[PDB]
Structures are given as structure tokens and as C-alpha cells.
Amino acid sequence: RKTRKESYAIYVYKVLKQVHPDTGISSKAMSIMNSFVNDVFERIAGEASRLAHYNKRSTITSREIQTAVRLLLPGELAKHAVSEGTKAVTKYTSAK
Amino acid sequence: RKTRKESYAIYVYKVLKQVHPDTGISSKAMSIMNSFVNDVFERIAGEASRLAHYNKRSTITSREIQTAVRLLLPGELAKHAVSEGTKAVTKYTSAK
Amino acid sequence: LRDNIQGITKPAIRRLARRGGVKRISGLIYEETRGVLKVFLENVIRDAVTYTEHAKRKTVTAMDVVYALKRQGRTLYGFG
Amino acid sequence: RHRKVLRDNIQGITKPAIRRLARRGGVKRISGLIYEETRGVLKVFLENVIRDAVTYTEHAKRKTVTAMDVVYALKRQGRTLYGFG
Amino acid sequence: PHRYRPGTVALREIRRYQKSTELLIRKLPFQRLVREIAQDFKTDLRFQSSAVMALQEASEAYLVGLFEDTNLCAIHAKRVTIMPKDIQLARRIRGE
Amino acid sequence: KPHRYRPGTVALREIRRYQKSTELLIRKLPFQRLVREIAQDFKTDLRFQSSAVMALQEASEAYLVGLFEDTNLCAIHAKRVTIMPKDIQLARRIRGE
Amino acid sequence: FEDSPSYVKWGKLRDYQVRGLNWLISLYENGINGILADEMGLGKTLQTISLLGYMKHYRNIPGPHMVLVPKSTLHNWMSEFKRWVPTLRSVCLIGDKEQRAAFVRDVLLPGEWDVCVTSYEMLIKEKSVFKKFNWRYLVIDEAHRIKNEKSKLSEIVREFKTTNRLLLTGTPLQNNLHELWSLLNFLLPDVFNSADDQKLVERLHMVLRPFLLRRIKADVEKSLPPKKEVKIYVGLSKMQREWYTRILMKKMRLLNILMQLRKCCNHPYLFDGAEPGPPYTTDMHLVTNSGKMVVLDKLLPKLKEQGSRVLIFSQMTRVLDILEDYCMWRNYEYCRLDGQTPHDERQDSINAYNEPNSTKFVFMLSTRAGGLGINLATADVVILYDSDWNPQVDLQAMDRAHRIGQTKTVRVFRFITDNTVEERIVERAEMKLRLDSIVIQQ
Amino acid sequence: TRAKAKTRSSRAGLQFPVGRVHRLLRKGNYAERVGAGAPVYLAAVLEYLTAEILELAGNAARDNKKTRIIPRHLQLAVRNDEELNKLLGRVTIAQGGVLPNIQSVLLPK
Amino acid sequence: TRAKAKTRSSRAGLQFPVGRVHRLLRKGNYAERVGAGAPVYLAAVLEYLTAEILELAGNAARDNKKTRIIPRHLQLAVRNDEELNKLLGRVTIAQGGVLPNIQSVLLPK
DNA sequence: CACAGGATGTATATATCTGACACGTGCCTGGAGACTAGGGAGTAATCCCCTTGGCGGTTAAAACGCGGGGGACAGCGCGTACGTGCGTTTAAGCGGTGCTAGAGCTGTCTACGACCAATTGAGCGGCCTCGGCACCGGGATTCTCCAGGGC
DNA sequence: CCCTGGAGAATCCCGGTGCCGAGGCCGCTCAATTGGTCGTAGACAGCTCTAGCACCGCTTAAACGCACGTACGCGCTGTCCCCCGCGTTTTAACCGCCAAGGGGATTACTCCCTAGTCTCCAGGCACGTGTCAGATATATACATCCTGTGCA
Ligand SMILES: Nc1ncnc2c1ncn2[C@@H]1O[C@H](COP(=O)(O)OP(=O)(O)O)[C@@H](O)[C@H]1O
């Protein structure tokens, strides 16, 4: 019984099946997707942390995440991602 | 009154008087030196933070600082800086 | 507000080129330099405005400019 | 008392291999002095990367260099690599 | 009617401007340009004088470095005259 | 009498072939020997995993390919078709290396 | 079948091969797969050709038969197949890709043959094609090649759909019982499917007797004067002692401590820096710095004033190079048989050393070079510079000169050193050799 | 009684681990405190980026007449799109190759 | 009672604030915990770098026949040293100017 | 100078084979539900500072025009270094031996070093004041560049 | 002829002006000192497995060396037009000053959000396993390049 390593592979596969119903992905491509998700996560988290430090705040919030997204992503991606995050936050708040 | 503002100016001035006894400095140069000190501090601290995360440890130690200095500074600067830090830590251990 | 880029004059561009260390300047290079300056300024001002709006302020600060330049990879010493 | 040497390992990066790399780069004609320059630039790049990787491995107190150490060195140099971690 | 050959005055200007340190663009036109560019991202933006000064410093440094690279490209092409093709080559090799 | 292609058709054919493929164009064992020799300077008694050598080879090949592309752009700038050490040096100088 | 058959041509068989043929026929009648351990020099290929000819002629079953041989014996086997039993139809698979495709399309796929003789590499290359045929008999020569499981050749040869199987190995037991179990698992997978004095020995003999046939090269020839062995101990030189202590502690990078102690017991100059400086001289430095070389330097002149014709077997070609330097210094006559010697050069050197009248005096062989061939009759003295883990390798080395063509007793001088890795190497080899004797010789 | 467990991903309609994102943010030393909606926002952004890159990669794979996605398809999708190329300008994809691009001067004429 | 206060800066023979560096490390969200030797080591490194730069700038200012140091002197010192230039290779110093360097082909024949 | 044909390279169906991917199962550990405590941040109010708008006068800098020489660019010729194809050689790649330790990985135990809290006193930041270094202007030198022996 | 003279620019040496750096005081907050605790990390022990060193045998793709010819780099030459140096006129930057008011910065209060705990249990991860997508080989069919030949 090896130790547990956590990867985003399951969720990447769910997204892939939602986008293209009948397609696959190899192990190397899944490794690349996991690395891409980790890199983007680290970029956004670090930018939000620096925003919180600059404004002299101790809490990372949805405002900080939105500002970090607009600072990192280039334009059309930025606006679409901002809309998606706002939709998810509204659904989470109105649901439970 | 206006909130207090911290800077390395007095320490930079003491170092300058130590190295060149009869040479002065101006306000713009002091701003530049304060920015330089803050920048190098941030670089070294961030490198040590990443090292601590990579090795999965909760403490930043002199080993982390030494490794970060070897990573960031090039060549002779790294060697002399490592020697100075080792000397300071030895003096602190003995004289405490 | 228009034609403000033409406020960046040919003598000023020539002075910048002389500090760069060039001798002969083609006549078509002024508009190209204006475009380069425009895109650089647009990127930096966009990031600075993002920081200013996050701070809920209406005034752009030298610290906002420095943070923008730092995240673009152009650290500036002398303004904080 | 009998010994001999074969060749320097930088010469193992062969002229046809450099030609193939230039073909992927999109190069039609290549000079004859290019190979020495390419060997020099490759050696410099490898020296920098391997030095950083060895620093990471020494910090971890290991004697084996890992793909993760290589990835960390490349990310420090600004050449993020996807696929090995 | 004394007259200098075409190129000595340029070298004198090169030397004097490389020795000097002041800004080489007019402050009021630069400030108007900055405000006009900021008109697109948000209305009614007020600027500290320090902010415009820092923007001017960064812009001039960027342009000087670009011109140095452009001169190198022109000399590589066996020319003494810099051209828009030289500027474009410099941008492409830098990564812009 | 024997068939022969003009000087430059085979070069374009190889350009297309290697821009279609994805494999490594440097020999594995020579690259491994080079990596070990370089590591011997920085520290002795060093062992390398196989994945580390593969990562180094991938990164090195990518760097060399990008360098050659910028070199070809500089050569085209000089109204030439051949690449030269001058082009390599100019590319490195502008990139900041 | 107490008498030699009739299908054999070019001479009649003898008692030992006729008894082997009877044993193999009984094995086929009982439907069992077995091992012939007749030892080199008794006619195993002759017996196998006899068995295949018998199965073709007396039994009306001309079927797909395969013989797996090392590439070095393909031509000898084909010549024997044509000579002894010309009735059979034999086809060989060797050559480049185009030659292999041409051969398979022309002869193999049409299917007008009876025996297919292929090498191990050609079996690995053409496994997909070879797996089609309804294989009846599978004779594997040098069965100790597949003695290890988890190996690609072993699994490939197991995956064939075969009916009758046979192994031809002179050394069924090499180190331990695992390899013997692997060979027996290839023979009869169901009978042995796990892991192999009154608790042992007797049970092993009663299990193995219906599956193994072995006759030593002593009940047929009554010749070949008996082997003589001298185990000569060697004192460590002073530089050897210094390097031994240094390596016992731990700039020279040393990874395998055992593999450093081994050559350190051979010669210090194999390292870097133990050799003297740039002058590159070759005058008595080699002899004095190595105790084994001092002993050998004393030993060779006596034999040379006597029978001479000495063979030196070593496990390191670097040591072979040092011995070449010594031979040049002493102006002896030397021949080097190494793993780097091309095939044509080997045969010419062997023939030159085996001429009716030669001036050659020293023949140097790597302990694992060549293999199951190499005729060296003029020799009388065998020197084992290094001892190996597997004692059967040294047994083969010392029977390379101890064959039917010899007339004088072979004196095997084995160099060992006190309190070194050589002691434990020789002890391990002796344990393995005693196990081999107690298991196989009965 | 004890209400049934409903995942925060299901609450926000996401296919990404909101709880894992929250734990990573808390353990990564980015701030002392983390908001409730920040992990949801970050998970949604990661989901959108994954969807974009995977859509382009699937288009490329169907264009090459294959069902499985390979790093060559990933590199082809990352290039040929301006926004993703800017986002991943300094990233090397293993077994990715380069784009087909021959300078018009080199073309024979 | 308590003894006289003795700063760690003097206890380590330095001129930079060890306690201030310790506080900045604690409040910077770099790790969960900070060792005792890390502030001392970091202060020593910072002091070495500052002293090196200041010595070079003072030499430059003396070559300019001035007492006070200005950004031009700082830029000259930084760009005239290979290692410091590499350290500050992506940094712009305000009111610094550029080094005097004219290409040889542009000089008069 | 524009086709015909030849020889070569390349895309195309098609059949085979394999090994990795997608799936199912069991378990376990980290995430969700319910809950309390506390302090960070939102919100409102106030103060003063620093940004913006406007005006007048100076003057350096920009815009414009002109005249002319030097650089860019095209064309031409050459002799030379590199691509192309071919015949030989070599070492990479693959498959095996033969050992031992060796180094990394996981599970326990215990101690010492870092956090937390209260108290307190120097160190540091901010506020004033003042003289010396930088600066600005003025005037006498020395170096350099451009005609002209085509001085 | 290259060397001489004229002319402009750069440099060096003195003398008056101003403002900025250096010093000197006051308060307050932040760092130092003790005391107490616990959890991280050092230290140890057991296990397993990949890495390493020195070899053998074999196949075969790739490197290596060679000779030919041909585009291509490189120098040279001529043309012309574009860029530069200089004088003149004009426009707007620059500086100083004044006035007003928005907005940045600080403070106090309260509440609402989040950290931390403890159960509880389902999602995610490791382990096996079998079938299909892709890799390979092979024989056609098609597109491409190159040369010769009536055009000359
Ligand atoms: N038919 C034979 N009868 C007797 N001795 C033989 C025969 N064939 C070969 N030998 C001897 O046996 C030695 C090697 O035999 P080997 O090659 O094992 O025979 P096979 O190839 O039939 O097994 C040779 O030196 C030869 O002298």
C-alpha cells in the first residue's frame, strides 16, 4: 500500500467528458494538465497574497481573487473567468 | 499624527560611515538603498519559503537561508555572503 | 482628448536615441516609437488602475505604479 | 601500465544532431563554425541548471538528483517545464 | 560659413546625453498622454506627481534599452541607420 | 546521370519532417555522459535518476530550438540564408544572456 | 532400441549415445520433458539429431520442430544435420531484415520443412511469426541461458504452444535451486510450480532421476590425465595494502566497494594516481607493486624451462593489458583472446597457438570469452588470476585445456590473497561447487 | 437529526474540489485567514481555464483523426491561440514539438 | 529583577536590526515558524550587500570629485560590476542614466 | 523558354498486435454539519492636504525651410564553403551475469527550541535648526574638427 | 603631400547663493527578559529496491569520411535621394502664484465572519484487470521535383 498522492486527474477527466463526450487522454497529457492547474493556482494565490499584504489585510477574499485574475489572465480570458467566478459565488451564497 | 514609517536609513548610514568614513548620501540614494534592501529581503525570504515547502517543513532556519543565498547570489558574492552569515551565527551562538 | 501621442516630439525621440547610442535615424521610426510607447504605457496603466480600484481609491499612487512595474518584471528603485 | 582516452563528452553532441535541431528550428543553410558555438551555449545552460539542482539536492540531504529538483531549478531560471511534476 | 560634417554633432549629442541624467521628454505632454490613456480604463482618475514621474522614468528606460538593441541590429545588418525593421526585430527577439 | 536533388530541397523536406515529429534529436547515452561529467565538477558521488536526465534533455532541446529560431530571424535580417556565430551572439545579446 | 538405428549415415553411433536415444524415446513414451546433461564432448547434438530422425521416420509425425541454438553453433548444427541424417529437411533463420523476410516467405510460410534452427536473437525478432506454427518439439541448446525467469527469452519460449520439450545443458545447476526449478518449470509447469541426511538429497535424487541423464567424461575415454590443482596464496604488496586500507575507509569516486577491493587485489595501477608520474616507464614497477605478479614472475620461467604453454584466465581486460605489458617486458610470446577480438581474428589466433610447431608460450583469455569452444591442446598449465562467483565458469575455463586432445596433466594454479575479498569469493565458489557435486554427480 | 452531506462543489455547481482548494489555500502560507467564497471563485476560474484548453486540444485531436489527447495536441492548442500563448509564454511542454513555420524567404522561387 | 537590555544586533556584531528582521519574517507569511539563527544570517547577508554597493559607489563618487553619493553614482557602481549587475539586471534606478558606450563602427574614420 | 516523362518521396487503405487506459472494488482519512468565541473589517464621522483649475510673463525648445554630401541599395562578378549522395565504421541499443550494500521510505520515541504572555525601558521616528557642499555664473586655457599643398 | 591656421567646443580655476544633509531633542512603541509548554524535528530501526561496476554477445541504425558541383556570401561600383546641420520664426513648456474642494488618512464602534473542535461518513485513492486505440508493416496511388528537348 503506497502512500497517497493527490492529483486533479479525476476532475480534469470530468471536465473533459463534459466538453467532449467521446474522447480520451493519455498519462503524459494528464500530468501536463495537473502541472498547468498547479502553476495557475500558485500564480493566483501568490498574487492575492501580495494584494492582501499591500492593502494591509489578513484575509484572502473573492475580491482579492478577482483582482488577481484580472492581473494575471490576458483580457478576454480575464473577463470570462470573472463572470464564471461571480456566477459560482452567487450560486453558492444563494444556495447554502 | 502621521503614522510611523519604518526604513533602514539609519543602519545604511552606519554601514556607510563604517566603509567610507567621510562620504555622505542624499535622499534619492537613500530611497534607492531602502528599496534595494527590501527587494533582496523579499527575494531571500521567498526562496526560503519555497524551500521549506519543497522539503515539507514548518520552520525557516539558517540552512534554508544559506541555500537561498547560494541560489540567488552569483559566485563570489554568494561565497563571501555565506562566510559572513556563518561568522555572525557563530558569534551569536557563542556570546548568547 | 486626441493627438496627445503627437505631444511626444521628434526632438525628444532623437534625444532618447542619442542616449541609446544611435547616429542616423530613419524618418519612419518616430511613429513606430510612438506606438511602442503607447502599448507599454497602456499595459502599465491598466495594472496600476487595477491596483487602485482594488484599494477603493480614485487616486493612482506611486506605489501602485511600482507594484505594476514589479509584476511586469521591471522593478523600479527610488519611489518606494 | 596501459590506458587510453576516447573523446571529450561535449563532442558526443554530434554535428548531425545539431543539424536536426536546426532543422526543427527552421534553418536551411548552416555554417561550419556553428557547432562549436552550440556546444558552448549548451554547456553554459547545463552548468547553470545542474548547479541549481545540486543545490536543491544538497539542501534535501540526498545523494540522488530528482526530476522534481530539475523542475525547481528550471522554474527558478524562468523555464517552467510541464510533464515531470 | 563654418559648418560641421554630417555626423560629428550627432556624436557630441551622444556623449552629452550619455553623461547627463535628466528626463528627455516634456513633462506636460507626457502627463496629458498618461491621463488620456487612463481615460479608457476608468473615468475621473487623479494622479500623484510621483506616479507620473515614475511612469516617465520607466518609459524612458524602456525606450533607451530598445534603442540600444535596435542599434545593435542595425550594425549587424552592416548599416549605421536604424529602421522600423530593426525595432521589430529587437521586439521579436526580446519576446514582445 | 544519377538522380540528384537541387541544393536546398532536402533541407526543406527535413525541416518539415522534424517540425512534424516530437521525439528527442540528441542521443540519450552521450547526453547522460555529458550530464554526469558536468555534475562531477559541482559535487562528487552524485547519482541521477532516469527522469532527471530526460527532463534535462527536454529542456536543453527546447532552449536550443528557440535559440536557432531567433538565429534564423537574425540571419534573414542580414539578408542571408545561412546562420552564423554572429547571429547566435546577437540573439543571445538581445535576449539578455 | 538397444542397437544403433539405420537412418543414421556417415558412421555408426556408440553405446552412450544409443542409451541416450533410448532414454529420450522412453521420455517421449511417458510424455515427459527432460534435460540431457551429457557434458561437453559426448555427442549431445548427435543424440538430438538421432531423436528427431527417429520421431520423423519410425513415428509417422513429420511436424514443426524447432531447435534453439546459440548463433555461434548454427553452422555446426546445420552441417551435422546434413551429414548424419540427410533425410531430414532443415531450414535456418538468420540475416538482415530483408533476408529474414525473404526466407520466411520463401520457405517458412509455405511449410515444406521439418526442423527449424534459429538463434535466440532471431527468436526475439520473429516471435510473432514463430508463434503461429503448431510447435511439436522444442530443443533448446545451452538451457542455462533461460535459467533465470523474469527474462524476455524465458517468457517468450514459455508462451509458445508446444507439445514436447527438451533441454540440452552441461551445467543444469549454476548457483542455487531457483534456476534448476526454472528449467524444470519450463519442462513440466504443473509438477514444479513453486519452490524446490534424510530430509534432502534422497528426495532430490528420486525426484530428478526420471528427469535428468548425465554421464561424466570418464566412463568413455579412460584417458586425459587427471586434473591437478594448486591453490597458491599471495602476499599483499605495500601499495596494495595502502590502497586496501584507503578503500576500506571509503578525490576518486568509488561506488561499488566490492568492485574496488577486487581490482585493488589485482593491481593498484587500475586506479588513477597509483601509477607513477608522466615518465610512463615500464621497468619492474608492475612486478614489485603486485604480489600476484611477483609470484607469476617467479612461476613462469620454471614452467618455460619446463613444458611451458601456459594459459592465463582473467576476469578483467585491464589486468589483461597489464599482463601484455609484462609479456612485452619479458619478451614472451602472447596471444590475447578477449570479448573485443573479432570472430575471424579469434580463429586465426587459436589455430596459430595450436600449430604443430609454434613459438607461442602464453595465451591470455577472459574468463567468460568465446564460450564452449576454443581448442587449446598444446597447453599444460592453467593460471587463474582471478576467481569468480560461479565456479562452473572456472570449471569451463580449466576444461578448455582439459579435453580429449590433451596428453599431459593440467596444473591449475589459482592465485588467492590473505584476508581479502578473494577469500570470501573462493569460499562462496566452493560452497556452490560442493552443492553442484552433491546434487548432480549422483 | 444529522442532515445529509452535500459537497460545496455541488452547492456551487463545480466539478472541482472546493474543499481541497480551501485546504491548499490554508496550508500554503498565503494569509492568516481565508474567505468562504474565495475557494469557490478560484475553483471556478481553474475549471474555466481547463475547459478552454481541453476544448482546443479536443479540436486539434479530432483534426488529427485521433480520440486520445497527447502533449502534441496540447502544445498545438496552446500555441495558435493568442491569449493562451501569452499566458503560457515561458512554459515548455514535454513531447510537444514546435509549430509548422517556414520563413517565406527560404521557400524556393 | 532583570539585567540590562542587550540587542541581538550587538550580540552578533552587526549593524542591521535582527529583531526587526525577525518581526518581518514572522509577519510576512513565509512559514509557520522562524528559527533564531535565520534573522542573524539574513541581517549579515544584507549588511554585506549594502556595504559592497556603498563602497563601489563611494569610489565612483570620489572619481567624480564629489562627497555625497547620488543615483548616478549608484548606477555607475552597479553597472560597472559584473556580479552586482547580474543581481540587479532587471532593475531600473531612477535618475541613473546609462554607461558611456559608443560602438566602434560609428567612430570617425 | 514551356511541356513530358521518369524517378522519388509521400499519403492511403488495410490487417495485426499489444499494452495502457478506463473501469470496478474496498477502505480510510479528510471534508462536511453543528457549535462556540473573539477580533478583523465594515461603516460612519472628521480633518487637512494635496490635487486640479486658472492666469501672466520668459524663454528655451520645437517647426520649417534649405542646401549638400554620405549612406543605402541595386547590380555584377568570383572563388569557396556547404549540401548531396555514397561507401565504411563505430558505437548505441538491447539482452543477459553477479554481487552487495546503499539510499530512500515509514514507523516510534523523546527532548529542546520556538510560540505566548506580561512587563518595561532604550531605540527609533519625527520635529526643528543651521552651516557647508553643490550650483550658478564668469573668464582664461587646451583639445578637436574642417578648409587648404586640392595651404 | 599631410601639416598649418582658424574657429568652436570642452575644461579648468575663482567667487557669490541657497537649500539640503547632518546634528540635536522628545515620546512612544516596539524589542528584550523570564517563565512555561508542547509539538516539531532529530535520532533510530527495519525493508525493499533501484542504482552501480566490470563484462559478453549480437544487431543495426547512425555517425563518419570523401568528392563534386553549385548556389551563396562577399567585395566592389555607381546613383540618387534621403538624412543632417544651420538659421529663423513660432508655439507652448516652465515657473510662480492663488484658490477651492475632493478625497486620502485616521479613529471609534459594533457585528458578523472565520478559526478551532468533535463526530461522522462518503469521496477519492490504490490495486487488479480486460479490451480497444494506436503503432507498425505493406503494397498501391498520387503528388513533386528535375532534366531534356523542340523552341532557338
Ligand atoms: N561421433 C562421435 N563419436 C565420438 N566422439 C565424437 C563424435 N563427434 C564428436 N566427438 C568428439 O566430441 C568432442 C565434442 O563433441 P560435441 O561437439 O559435444 O558433439 P555433439 O556436437 O554431437 O554434441 C570433439 O572434440 C570430438 O572429438
Numbering used by the authors:
A (entry chain H), B (entry chain D): 27 to 122
C (entry chain F): 22 to 101
D (entry chain B): 17 to 101
E (entry chain E): 38 to 133
F (entry chain A): 37 to 133
G (entry chain W): 168 to 363, 377 to 430, 443 to 634
H (entry chain G), I (entry chain C): 10 to 118
Can you list sentences taken from the study reporting this PDB entry?
All known remodeler enzymes use an Snf2-type ATPase motor to slide nucleosomal DNA around the histone octamer, but the precise underlying mechanism is unclear. Here, we use cryo-electron microscopy (cryo-EM) to visualize the continuous motion of nucleosomal DNA induced by human chromatin remodeler SNF2H, an ISWI family member. Based on the conformations of DNA at SHL2 and of SNF2H, we clustered our 13 structures into five groups (A to E).
In group C (guide strand movement, 30% of A-D particles), the direction of SNF2H movement changes compared to group B structures: SNF2H rotates downward and outward, away from the histone octamer, while the brace helix continues its outward movement. SNF2H adopts the canonical open conformation observed in group B, and moves as a rigid body relative to the nucleosome. These movements gradually pull the guide strand of DNA outward at SHL3 and correct the distortion at SHL2 and SHL3 seen in group B structures, while preserving the interactions between SNF2H residues and DNA. Mutating brace helix residues markedly reduced the chromatin remodeling activity of SNF2H, supporting their essential role in DNA translocation. Conformational changes in SNF2H induced by ATP hydrolysis pull the nucleosomal DNA at SHL2 in two steps (from A to B and from B to C structures), resulting in the formation of a DNA bulge that accommodates one additional base pair at SHL2.
